[PDB]
Write a protein that binds this DNA or RNA. Structure first.
Ligand SMILES: [Mg+2]
Ligand SMILES: [Mg+2]
Ligand SMILES: [Mg+2]
Ligand SMILES: [Mg+2]
Ligand SMILES: [Mg+2]
Ligand SMILES: [Mg+2]
Ligand SMILES: [Mg+2]
Ligand SMILES: [Mg+2]
Ligand SMILES: [Mg+2]
Ligand SMILES: [Mg+2]
Ligand SMILES: [Mg+2]
Ligand SMILES: [Mg+2]
Ligand SMILES: [Mg+2]
Ligand SMILES: [Mg+2]
Lengths: 60, 143, 262, 62, 203
RNA sequence: UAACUUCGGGAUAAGGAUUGGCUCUAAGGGCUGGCAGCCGACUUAGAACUGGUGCGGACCAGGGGAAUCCGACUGUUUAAU
RNA sequence: GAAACUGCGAAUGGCUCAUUAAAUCAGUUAUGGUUCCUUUGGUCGCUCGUACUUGGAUAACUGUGGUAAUUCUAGAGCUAA
RNA sequence: UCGCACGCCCGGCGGCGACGACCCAUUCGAACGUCUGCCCUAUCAACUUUCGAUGGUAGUCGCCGUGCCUACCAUGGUGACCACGGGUGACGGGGAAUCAGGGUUCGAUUCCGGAGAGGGAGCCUGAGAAACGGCUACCACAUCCAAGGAAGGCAGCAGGCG
């Protein structure tokens, strides 16, 4: 499950490959346009809150 | 007498509620040299579909026929008779069409078998497109 | 069908355009305008088939899109603009003026006129009509609306309009004695003095009229277009003067003109 | 819808009786006295002359 | 969908007619508005030619004209009491053309007070009302209101409706298509016709 | 609502739909002095709402069709096979 | 001056004859019982109540992507009438 | 809102157009109506009606007239002068062939009018569509597929199978 991360203040964005279910428990069962603290996304991710803007499905 | 229906019956133009300390009635001449019957002026009935007292205008064709049945209410049926020429035999062939016509209650003495003059109008109902404009009594039938 | 038509077959075109059969499948459909489709004459037909200033449809498009053609005092860039009775075609660059007038047959004839005659035109009124605040109106046969007319103008009169200002200069009252031109029917193009006015309530009134040779002919009132007091036209009449010569003496003058010409 | 005429016409008509000796010998005179090519040249001339007669006869009754 | 067409029903003789074309766009119907009484709600419908029609779905106010005095005021609709077409259309409170409704007396009572200077209805007189009926009035206009007294007498039938606080009106506009509930105040012979119909209906 | 028929039947043929509760509406009459007043008694039709589609809720209460044999039918008969 | 927003057109034309028997259609008339883009002509300070020009989005574009696949589209950044 | 010019006064005035707008006429129409007109069949003689049939009143809906539909009423309407039902190897007409005078047969076919886009039904936008080289279903047929899904309508021009 790829993660498409965009930071509008600097206007920069990149794609992050993540494959660990333990790291994504914070995201599941959450609707779109909800704010989630991404502290469990890794060691570089503390103090970040990321809004979910919706992605694609396995079939696109 | 007149108010025999659920809604109040009146002519749409006459305002009958003027402050005072006989009802005036609307009527018109329909043209084409047709004389408005007297009992349409001193009468007391009302009718949307009466040519002399309602909002129907006479246009189109002016036809004639003979009365056949008078069982419907404020509408009768006349019968038009004519001949149809067939070229092969050089002969004619009697044909007839009978048609529904709205008889205003001003033409009050109408029997079976007299000649009426009908003028085309707005389509009044499913099968009625004509009003009676004058009635001529048949031969004899005066007594 | 499912909407308004936009084409016109040649064989279904009005006959007086004199369109042929083998040039094409389609005929120029007149654009919507002041004149009816069957009684008009598209600008395409006038320049390519009558005057022959062009040869094809593209050549006339170049002519009218250089703003050379001025119809009724206004510049028109529509190749299919419908020009009808009494319209003044004015091609200023070549120094030439026209007025569409029916000839003795059912056709629009080319009729060169002087520049002083091209400043005005006659037009039949169709309606008398009161505006929003008591302002009188009238409607001409070519769909002009003009306010505050002379109160003595009635529904069948004709008026003289100055094409620069569009205002009435003088009018002719419809009554017996006045000269007339027939714009429609089996007698169109004929000229005569109105003789009688027989009116049918509900139906169409008929007008009896006799030409300068004593021949009498009738027509419906909707085809009557008065063009002068007494027997003096207010316009210049074309060749033949609106006298329809029968087939018998048409050949008699055709060959006698031929043996006069050799 | 195409732009062409389709207006055509036959210029002759065959006789009803095919094998009449009197008729055969009379149109063999003409075809040899005028050097014609077949009977259809004789037939189309009888046919044009029949139009002229048919026009006059209906005019004469007028 | 809904069709207003003549080809789907029997001929004059009574024979079945077989259609030759399917349903057309211009032969369409739309669901009935069924205008109730309540806070104002109109939806607009785009109709043939690009025009507009206004579906009044809930409608509470409407201006009615008092014909005998030519006084047209905006009034609030109370109730529907009679309908000549259907008794089911008065059990539900739906406004259709030519249905007898109740409207309040207040806009007309004010006008009569300030135009004739008489009390109508009014079986204590509050300060605002007593002063308009007893204001310091010069003579020059006193006779004006005094000659206006001659025709100040209204019909008896209207009088007890004024002291009751509400009038009987008849809707003349078509609220399901115009979006308005306009009409006129009943009076005269037409008033007594609808009064005995309402009375005898109750039984 | 069929075959057939002694034209009487077959026939409740066969086959379908509906059915509660509640709130209403309309029609159907007497007596006294085309109107008014005072009295009524039960029925039928229609509508809105409403219930976990449930309603002839227990009781009562025809399975049907296509043919053959015999006796026309109703009736009677070996009390104890 | 590509691209994209905007406006218009795509209801014409072309093909075929299955349906259709007072239906279609034809001639004749009515809309004084109606809609009408467009063209032409009129109207367009008639109203008695920030204008030296108001607002925030969104394509085209840059950039990050998904699906085996479509004239499929998502999230981010700008900017016009 | 936009473009060409470019001037005149003592910053203010200026010409010619383009585009757009409410309304009225006009044009192109469209839609409902009027009257008369059609092939064969009686082994089709009675048909239509509380599942609108024919009228009345009040309304709803519709761009408007109208059983178009609703409520309440009346019992009407058509037929031997051929109704109603059925058949058509029936799209109608202007026309075509044959013809002395009469007629008989043909008109799928280039012009006008109708209808339809595999069969039905329902809509969006639009002045104008119940549109199919527009959309949404169901039926039949049929295409690609990673098996999760996507896509379709030649009675247009060619061309192919039958
Ligand atoms: Mg004969
Ligand atoms: Mg077409
Ligand atoms: Mg049985
Ligand atoms: Mg046996
Ligand atoms: Mg027995
Ligand atoms: Mg025993
Ligand atoms: Mg069939
Ligand atoms: Mg067929
Ligand atoms: Mg044909
Ligand atoms: Mg179609
Ligand atoms: Mg096919
Ligand atoms: Mg379709
Ligand atoms: Mg196609
Ligand atoms: Mg198409």
């Amino acid at each position: 499950m790829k993660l498409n991360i965009s930071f509008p203040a600097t206007g920069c964005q990149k794609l992050i490959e993540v494959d660990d279910e333990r790291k994504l428990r914070t995201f599941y069962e959450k609707r779109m346009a909800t704010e989630v603290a991404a502290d469990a996304l890794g060691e570089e991710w503390k103090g970040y809150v990321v809004r979910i803007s919706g992605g694609n499905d396995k079939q696109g | 007498d007149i108010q025999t229906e659920r809604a109040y019956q009146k002519q749409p133009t006459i305002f009958q509620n003027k402050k005072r300390v006989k009802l005036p009635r609307y009527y018109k001449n329909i043209g084409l040299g047709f004389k408005t019957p007297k009992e349409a002026i001193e009468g007391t009935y009302i009718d949307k579909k009466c040519p002399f007292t309602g909002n129907v205008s006479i246009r189109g064709r002016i036809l004639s026929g003979v009365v056949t049945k008078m069982k419907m209410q404020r509408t009768i049926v006349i019968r038009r008779d004519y001949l149809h020429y067939i070229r092969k035999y050089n002969r004619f062939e009697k044909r007839h069409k009978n048609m529904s016509v709205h008889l205003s209650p001003c033409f009050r003495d109408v029997q079976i078998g007299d000649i009426v003059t009908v003028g085309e109008c707005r389509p009044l109902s499913k099968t009625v497109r004509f009003n009676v404009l004058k009635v001529t009594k048949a031969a004899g039938t005066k007594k | 069908a499912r909407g308004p038509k936009k084409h016109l077959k040649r064989v279904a075109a009005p006959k007086h355009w004199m369109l042929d059969k083998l040039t094409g499948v389609f005929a120029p459909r007149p654009s919507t305008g002041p004149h009816k489709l069957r009684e008009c004459l598209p600008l395409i037909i006038f320049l390519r088939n009558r005057l022959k200033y062009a040869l094809t449809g593209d050549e006339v498009k170049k002519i009218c899109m250089q703003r050379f053609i001025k119809i009724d005092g206004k510049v028109r860039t529509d190749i299919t603009y419908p020009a009808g009775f009494m319209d003044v075609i004015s091609i200023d660059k070549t120094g030439e003026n026209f007025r569409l007038i029916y000839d003795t047959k059912g056709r629009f004839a080319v009729h060169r006129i002087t520049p002083e005659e091209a400043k005005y035109k006659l037009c039949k009124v169709r309606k008398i009509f009161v505006g929003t605040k008591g302002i009188p109106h009238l409607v001409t046969h070519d769909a002009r609306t003009i306010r505050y007319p002379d109160p003595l103008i009635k529904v069948n009169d004709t008026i003289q309009i100055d094409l620069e200002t569009g205002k009435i200069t003088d009018f002719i009252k419809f009554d017996t004695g006045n000269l007339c031109m027939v714009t429609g029917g089996a007698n169109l193009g004929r000229i005569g003095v109105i003789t009688n006015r027989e009116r049918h309530p509900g139906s169409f009134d008929v007008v009896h009229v006799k030409d300068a040779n004593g021949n009498s002919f009738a027509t419906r009132l909707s085809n009557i277009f008065v063009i002068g007091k007494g027997n003096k036209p207010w316009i210049s009449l074309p060749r033949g003067k609106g006298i329809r010569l029968t087939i018998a003496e048409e050949r008699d003058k055709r060959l006698a003109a031929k043996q006069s010409s050799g | 819808p195409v732009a062409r005429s389709w207006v055509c016409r036959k210029t002759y008509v065959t006789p009803r009786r095919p094998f009449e000796k009197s008729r055969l010998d009379q149109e063999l005179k003409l075809i040899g006295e005028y050097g014609l090519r077949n009977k259809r040249e004789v037939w189309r001339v009888k046919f044009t002359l029949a139009k002229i007669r048919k026009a006059a006869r209906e005019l004469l009754t007028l | 969908g809904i069709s207003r067409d003549n080809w789907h029903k029997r001929r004059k003789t009574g024979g079945k007619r077989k259609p030759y074309h399917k349903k057309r766009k211009y032969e369409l119907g739309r669901p009935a508005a069924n205008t109730k009484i309540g806070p104002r709600r109109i939806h607009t419908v785009r109709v043939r030619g690009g025009n507009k029609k206004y579906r009044a779905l809930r409608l509470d106010v409407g201006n009615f004209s008092w014909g005998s005095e030519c006084c047209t005021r905006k009034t609030r609709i109370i109730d529907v009491v009679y309908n000549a077409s259907n008794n089911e259309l008065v059990r539900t409170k739906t406004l259709v053309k030519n249905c007898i409704v109740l409207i309040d007396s207040t806009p007309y009572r004010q006008w009569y007070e300030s135009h004739y200077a008489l009390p109508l209805g009014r079986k204590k007189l509050t300060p605002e009302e007593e002063e308009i009926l007893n204001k310091k009035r010069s003579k020059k206009i006193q006779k004006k209101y005094d000659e206006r007294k001659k025709n100040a007498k209204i019909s008896s039938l209207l009088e007890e409706q004024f002291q009751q606080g509400k009038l009987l009106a008849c809707i003349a506009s078509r609220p399901g298509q115009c979006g308005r509930a306009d009409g006129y105040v009943l009076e005269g012979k037409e008033l007594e016709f609808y009064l005995r119909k309402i009375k005898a209906r109750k039984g």
